[PDB]
Amino acid sequence: TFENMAGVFMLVAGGIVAGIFLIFIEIAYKRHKDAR
Amino acid sequence: FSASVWVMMFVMLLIVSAIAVFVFEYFSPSFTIGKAIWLLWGLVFNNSTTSKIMVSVWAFFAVIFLASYTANLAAFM
């Protein structure tokens, strides 16, 4: 509806998508280091 | 009682499920078609390896949505 619950959702959505984008590359680098 | 617009959140859930399935498929390097949907629908709701753990962060949004839904249903009567 209005800005209230749109914003309260988009903040956590941005946090989750940033976490997904960071964790993928982090675990990829960790796996590459482990299997060097 | 909930989703007054009735057109925003009901398609946001669909698109977020679609992108979750897409990223689960992309994480191949268990089944994307069957298991991903079941785990997504059994994680948000009570009724029901490494890649699953790192994407289990969606439980925050799941519990927030459940709390908001139950609060709205209890306070809109």
Query: Does B22 touch chain A if contact means CB atoms closer than 8 Å?
Result: no
- Provide the 3-class DSSP secondary structure of residue B69: helix
CA B74 → CA B2, B67, B71, distances in Å? 11, 11, 5
B50 interaction partners in chain A (CB closer than 8 Å) = 27
Please give the resolution of this entry in Å, rounded to 1 decimal: 3.8
* Partner-chain contact A12 B61, CB within 8 Å: yes
Instruction: Kindly state whether B48 is in contact with chain A, defined as any CB-CB distance less than 8 angstroms.
Output: no
Please indicate the experimental technique that yielded this structure: cryo-EM
Residues 6+ apart with CB under 8 A from B3: B9, B10
A1 contact B CB<8A? yes
Å between A33 CA and nearest CA of chain B: 16
Nearest to A16 among B12, B27, B57 (CB): B57
CA B43/CA B41 separation, integer angstroms: 6
Contact B59, B77 (CB under 8 A): no
Q: Nearest C-alpha of chain B: how many angstroms from A7?
A: 13
